[PDB]
Design a protein around this ligand. Structure first.
Ligand SMILES: Nc1ncnc2c1ncn2[C@@H]1O[C@H](COP(=O)(O)OP(=O)(O)NP(=O)(O)O)[C@@H](O)[C@H]1O
Ligand SMILES: Nc1ncnc2c1ncn2[C@@H]1O[C@H](COP(=O)(O)OP(=O)(O)NP(=O)(O)O)[C@@H](O)[C@H]1O
Ligand SMILES: Cc1ncc(CO)c(C=O)c1O
Ligand SMILES: Cc1ncc(CO)c(C=O)c1O
Ligand SMILES: [Mg+2]
Ligand SMILES: [Mg+2]
Ligand SMILES: [Mg+2]
Lengths: 292, 295
């Protein structure tokens, strides 16, 4: 039984739930022992007072991890990246993940390689507001080539694709550009259409075991931030442990997010702690809808 | 019922369990929602590669927190690993500002003030050696009078009091000193006597509801393992039981200790405590270690 290594490289906040405040606890609560790298430490998602890791500090932590991993070819390495605020750090994270892969080189374990995965949540913005540089945007575009699974929201997809999304045809072309860049699975977590405001759509795409590409929509009804962060870390925990069919995994993840969402209306944050037994669950639905 | 605020000011590591990697999860898994300020981000307890907040960056976080409370909520500080003396003073200054801004100053409710606690775990060293900036020892001595509950190991007790502990009478002098400097509850988490090599002793002291000092000890069979952080586990569990469970503090200390011993017993394998695998016992509310008086 190869040894599980999950490395989660994201934001941390003094007050609230986002980046690694969600992911570190969801992982641990589900039986995992994640390595944690905090890219920033902010007062809260709203007051970005605090401290950022510069690229050299990222490289010092990550290089030490590559030192322990060299010659130690007995483990499955799983990177989950989210909020990185400057493109040098994004470049440095990418180089370090890349240098690890070079040393150690619809079921999810034949779409991608469970010995080594990079799951990139490309936290750049939402709904017209942008948290990073146009430099960070081009850094992810250079990194997509090396990413196993990318989980942008709709806005972030527009940024990496250079394509505004107004109807489903734009989504398909968007899924297409990211896939031909080398990403193995695209999930666009939420796309909202002008003509259906009560609902939002999650799309997922990938080549099948016959070199043919496949699309699926998930229709969900509607906000508190951090749903995307919950979604991503929940996705890796299902993939690496349960394994099996990705489209089943996604429904199961959606089952948990919705059920936590249902309790975080009385506030502004998600109720990560009040619903921790839900977060630790099986995911028991919204069934895939194929797209052409 | 008032809003609970727990603020854990400790270290963070990339790999392994110490400081806030323990306390955040312990707190969260027990249904609290700690605020979290990582004082350092190191690769591991043994590889202090990484970044350390300076005292201005500590003051940025905590002063923003003080602004949002200048109310109707109980405030519980837990401080642990802090490498830098000026960062220790800035934590002290800010905790005191919060005390100043609200005119602040065996059932635990009658021993301490559950409106506002500073539980100071003054991490400085162990087994004869020191692991902090050396001026940090002076900075924790400045803080003693301001601290409600202080939980040093033996060596840190010796540092704060200026005397070496070789016999029980030395433990009592140390408990007497720290209590008379104004701490409400002193807990020396382990003492190793050159004459009882198979056991560890934990001591607790305080003034009871009659303004008489009492001293209790817990005799722990020394399990011979290779992992640290049980002190961090001890202190966050202590706070959690104090603010949720309340009641008899000596009971609270027996329960914490049992949980700690059980985690250690399922962590004889490796070099880190097996927090995750033993998270369920950690979540709990088998008593092998029990208090005895010392007089
Ligand atoms: N109003 C809503 N009601 C219920 N579920 C929702 C709602 N909005 C989002 N979700 C769920 O939350 C998931 C995350 O969607 P999304 O809004 O793209 O995350 P995000 O936070 O914007 N991405 P990021 O912050 O960059 O990591 C979706 O896949 C839905 O399952
Ligand atoms: N070898 C051991 N056998 C049994 N219990 C132990 C052992 N070491 C520690 N403990 C328990 O853990 C508690 C905390 O240990 P202690 O060594 O006093 O904390 P610390 O030294 O500040 N932190 P650490 O770095 O983990 O040693 C003690 O009070 C005991 O309950
Ligand atoms: C600090 C920080 N980290 C992560 C996210 C993504 O939810 C956000 C924005 O929602 C954020 O502000
Ligand atoms: C960073 C850090 N945090 C906590 C501790 C002790 O639990 C140590 C001691 O080894 C440490 O180095
Ligand atoms: Mg946690
Ligand atoms: Mg997303
Ligand atoms: Mg301690």
């Amino acid at each position: 039984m190869k040894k599980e290594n999950i490395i989660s490289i994201q934001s941390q906040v003094f007050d609230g739930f986002c980046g690694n405040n969600i992911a570190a606890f969801v992982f641990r609560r589900r039986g995992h022992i994640p390595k944690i790298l905090n890219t920033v430490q902010y007062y809260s998602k709203f007051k970005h007072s605090g401290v950022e890791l510069n690229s050299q500090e990222v490289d010092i932590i990550l290089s030490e991890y590559n030192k322990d991993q060299e010659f130690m070819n007995d483990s499955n390495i799983y990177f989950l990246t989210g909020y990185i605020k400057n493109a040098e750090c994004v470049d440095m994270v990418t180089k370090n993940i890349l240098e690890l892969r070079r040393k150690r080189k619809y079921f999810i374990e034949n779409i991608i390689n469970l010995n080594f995965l990079w799951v990139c949540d490309p936290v750049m913005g939402d709904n017209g507001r942008l948290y990073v540089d146009e430099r960070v945007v081009e850094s992810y575009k250079k990194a997509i080539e090396y990413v196993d699974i990318i989980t942008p929201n709709q806005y972030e997809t527009e940024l990496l694709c250079g394509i505004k999304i107004n109807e489903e045809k734009d989504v398909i072309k968007c899924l297409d550009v990211l896939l031909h860049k080398g990403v193995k699975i695209v999930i666009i977590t939420s796309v909202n259409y002008n003509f259906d405001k009560d609902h939002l759509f999650l799309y997922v795409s990938f080549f099948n075991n016959k070199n043919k590409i496949v699309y699926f929509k998930y229709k969900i009804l509607k906000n508190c931030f951090g749903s995307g962060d919950l979604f991503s870390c929940l996705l890796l925990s299902f993939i690496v442990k349960q394994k099996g069919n990705i489209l089943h995994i996604i429904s199961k993840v959606l089952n948990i997010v919705q059920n936590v969402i249902k309790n975080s209306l009385t506030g502004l944050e998600l109720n990560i702690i009040e619903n921790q037994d839900i977060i630790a669950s099986d995911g028991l639905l919204i069934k895939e809808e194929p797209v052409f």
